Amino acid sequence: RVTLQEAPGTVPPGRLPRHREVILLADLVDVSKPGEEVEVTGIYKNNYDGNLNAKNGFPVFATIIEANSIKRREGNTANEGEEGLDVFSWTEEEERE
Amino acid sequence: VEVIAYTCDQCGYEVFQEVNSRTFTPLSECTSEECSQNQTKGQLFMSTRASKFSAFQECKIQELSQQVPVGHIPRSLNIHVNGTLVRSLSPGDIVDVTGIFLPAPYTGFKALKAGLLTETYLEAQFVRQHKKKFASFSLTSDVEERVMELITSGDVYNRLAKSIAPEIYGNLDVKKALLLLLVGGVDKRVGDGMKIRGDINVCLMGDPGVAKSQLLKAICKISPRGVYTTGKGSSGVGLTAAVMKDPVTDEMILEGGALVLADNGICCIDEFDKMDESDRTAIHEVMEQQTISISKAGINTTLNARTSILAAANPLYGRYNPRLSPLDNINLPAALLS
């Protein structure tokens, strides 16, 4: 599990980011590294908590993101050339060409 | 608390109980016959007026330096005082306390450890204040004949100057200035309420090894209100009251902008060119009986700063100079010098 902030280039100026928690199941382990900008496709789910209801006085719920796909987006902001999780990967016919 | 009295909504006799331990539990249902019945005749409550109380206070004592063996740290001892003897001693005095050396259970900590270890305390019985009494020059026959003898002595100021610090040789005029500093100048205001102070600000200047610090120590000894300060060593000397974060409950007890006993005190300072900008700002603010009104958290209870300033500083070269003195100076503002 890992902490996900907002991209500093995406937040409105002079504001504060919003954190979330992302849980990475099998085969997605260690794909993400600290300090990098990433894009994650996942499922939004909610769960009960005790201290959260304690500190607010209202029936509030916590939410975590179960990761399902991860795509790195560090530096290479040109994101219109092609689709896919990895744009630096090739098919067999691309190797043939 | 000594005895706790309840009331049970007209249950005839009202239950009394006593507690000597530092903790207890209250009562809930009384033993009267109408409440010995299956249900209570009115619920009982604690009654403050009928209960008994005693004045209580807590103090701790520290060993003297003379009695500490070499290479050791002094220890402390707690004292509990009750009854009329409360408020019979003040911090900062030598006393001879007689009391009862009693144990104290550790269960108050509620750690469940120290199965056989317990704390100890003393309960006061009779206190000898010892030390010395200032008495505020309260008149008596003996002091009256003493001042008669002084009047018969004739000329006084020269003898007083000679009698301050015979250890340091010479320097008569410095001692004369010390005499004139100890009495104070013109005071008690003028017409239209204009401010004037009787305090005198004299600065001592000279080479190292002239025993100006020793003369300052002698003056501090001979004066009752003297406070001695020097270059660094601690941060609580100025700008903060001594009760900052002091209580065990951490009540943030403070006064704001104040100094050490600045009201009618004698601020003796050594190494006047050593302190930082904060103490320098404070001593510019204590100028000419001006109060100290520095605020940090909405506090504005200013201290009425009315003190005489006597400070000793050394040249930044460590010696006098053939070239001009005001440029050599003491590395001090000309406004402060004036």
Partner: protein
């Protein structure tokens, strides 16, 4: 005790209808207060009865009730309030306003004012008089009075009274049709509550003679006494003592052997003249006397006093939308050797002005972390609080560097913005500035120009409205007069009337300039333009700037601000131009 219920009430009522303060007058050895004041209350609709103890002591039967009141405050006060409640009908014989209002009394002056250093347990549940300084406060705390309940199964609701805080909950709903025991559920938001506020009080410094530390006693107030005091106040209170058991471990039934001490108070004390103005305002020499009346102890220095007075009066502020608002404040700088008592002038003006903060070289807003509580609050600095008044600054040379830019921000726009910790906002200042600075060295050399000795940047000193220079030079005569004046003082002045006059001029009066004054203004501008040039090709500096025109417009408006006029005259503009040019005449350096 059960003694005062029967006869003390009747005796107090009899002396209510029978009291005359002539008895107190005789006791003084140099009139029916209650009935006249009670009918005053009847015709007012108020609900309050102040009650002194000395005049209560003046009567021989009442002192018995006096002593019984010290022993038993609560019951005596309650029965006195009920007595007043019945006195309503006893005196009116509309009865409708009576049934709606409660009644309370405010005893005071019961006894000598004690201090926190001498409070023996003999003084528990006894009325005392206390004086001190209010330090801090707390948000108002709701108090449970009427418990609301609802039989959820049958939706039945019942209202329950309480006593001593503890609630006797209903073990079963009254509706025997359901008669269920466990269907009792309360509603938080349909109850009734009382407002409680806790104050922290400090002993006066008079009670600590030997440099010890003061102490703190907790306070409690109810209803009309809520928010009656705030931080820094000096008040005196009268209320009973109290002690309470401390819970210790909140999870356990035990209680500590010691009790917390706190007091509950019931009374707190602190510590058409417009016709007269015009009679004074009609005089011809109002200007000179008014100017000299604010610095009685200052010898000579008339022109700077006049300038400071006009700065205090202020100009006009307008907000026409076609070009944005125009600044209406005057800013003046003081310079010279520290032998002029120039801080005394700032001290005078600080207390003379309605609003103002006196500081020295942090002055603006900065977010702080709360000390007693753990929270974040936005805090505004000295400049923000001086809106509409005069902000006084000393030791202006020792201004550091970061803060100086802030001044350059505020003097040119009268608005300060902050972008920190996610907070972006703008705050209004709209304040006047008065500052003093010292030259570098033991003296200010007249040959030396002003700039280097005052070590301020040229733009900042150029953008002040005016400037004044004080130069003390040794002469036999002037020293003789100064020495004589100082000795005589050491060996015609109005009162807060000044403050109300200043306020009335500030907000009632909105003078405007007229067409005639425009010709004089433009002639003066052209004249100093010519005075700033010569026939030779030296390429003289342009000494007549637009700042001069703005300054003279503001000063002419200020001259009409005083004397309560509505339109300016020529005299205003001649005075303004002479004032603006006098400082320039002494602004030259060693050349020319």
């Amino acid at each position: 005790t059960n003694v005062s219920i029967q006869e003390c009430t009747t005796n107090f009522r009899n002396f209510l209808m029978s009291f005359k303060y002539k008895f107190r007058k005789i006791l003084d050895e140099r009139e029916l207060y209650y009935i006249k004041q009670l009918n005053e209350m009847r015709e007012l609709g108020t609900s309050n009865l102040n009650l002194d103890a000395r005049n209560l002591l003046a009567y021989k039967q009442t002192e018995d009730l006096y002593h019984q009141l010290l022993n038993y405050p609560q019951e005596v006060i309650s029965i006195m309030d009920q007595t007043i409640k019945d006195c309503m009908v006893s005196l009116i014989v509309d009865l409708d306003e009576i049934e709606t209002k409660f009644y309370k009394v405010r005893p005071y002056n019961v006894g000598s004012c004690k201090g926190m250093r001498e409070l023996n347990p003999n003084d528990i549940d006894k009325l005392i008089n206390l004086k001190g300084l209010v330090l801090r406060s707390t948000p108002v705390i709701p108090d449970m009075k009427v418990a609301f309940f609802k039989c959820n199964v049958c939706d039945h609701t019942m209202a329950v009274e309480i006593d001593r805080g503890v609630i006797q909950e209903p073990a079963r709903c009254e509706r025997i049709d359901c008669n269920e025991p466990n269907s009792m559920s309360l509603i938080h938001n349909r109850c009734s509550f009382a407002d409680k506020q806790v104050i922290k009080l400090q002993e006066t410094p008079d009670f600590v003679p030997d440099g010890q530390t003061p102490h703190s006693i907790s306070l409690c107030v109810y209803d009309e006494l809520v928010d009656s005091c705030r931080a820094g106040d000096r008040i005196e209170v009268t209320g009973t003592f109290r002690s309470i058991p401390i819970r210790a471990n909140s999870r356990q039934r035990v209680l500590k052997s010691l009790y917390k001490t706190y007091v509950d108070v019931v009374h707190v004390k602190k510590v058409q003249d417009l016709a007269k103005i015009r009679e004074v305002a009609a005089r011809e020499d109002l200007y000179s006397l008014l100017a000299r009346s604010i610095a009685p102890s200052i010898y000579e220095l008339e022109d700077v006093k006049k300038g400071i007075l006009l700065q205090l009066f202020g100009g006009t502020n307008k907000t026409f939308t076609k070009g944005g608002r125009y600044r209406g404040d005057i800013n003046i700088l003081l310079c010279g050797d520290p032998s002029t008592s120039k801080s005394q002038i700032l001290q005078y003006v600080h207390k003379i002005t309605p609003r103002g903060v006196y500081t020295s070289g942090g002055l603006t807003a900065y977010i702080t972390r709360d000390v007693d509580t753990k929270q974040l609050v936005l805090e505004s600095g000295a400049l923000v609080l001086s809106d509409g008044g005069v902000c006084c600054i000393d030791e202006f040379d020792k201004m550091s560097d970061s803060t100086r830019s802030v001044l350059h921000e505020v003097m040119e726009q009268q608005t300060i913005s902050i972008a920190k910790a996610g907070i972006i906002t703008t705050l209004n200042a709209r304040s006047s500035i008065l500052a003093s600075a010292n030259p570098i060295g033991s003296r200010y050399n007249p040959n030396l120009p002003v700039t280097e000795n005052i070590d301020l940047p040229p733009p900042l000193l150029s953008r002040f409205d005016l400037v004044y220079l004080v130069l003390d030079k040794v002469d036999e005569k002037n020293d003789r007069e100064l020495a004589k004046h100082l000795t005589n003082l050491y060996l015609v002045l109005p009162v807060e009337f000044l403050t109300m006059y200043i306020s009335y001029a500030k907000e009632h009066i909105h003078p405007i300039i007229t067409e005639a004054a425009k010709t004089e203004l433009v002639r003066a501008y052209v004249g100093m333009r010519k005075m700033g040039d010569d026939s030779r090709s030296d390429e003289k500096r342009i000494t007549a700037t637009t700042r001069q025109l703005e300054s003279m417009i503001r000063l002419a408006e200020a001259h009409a601000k005083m004397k309560l006029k509505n339109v300016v005259e020529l005299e205003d503009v001649q005075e303004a131009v002479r004032l603006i040019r006098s400082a320039i005449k002494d602004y030259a350096t060693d050349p020319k």
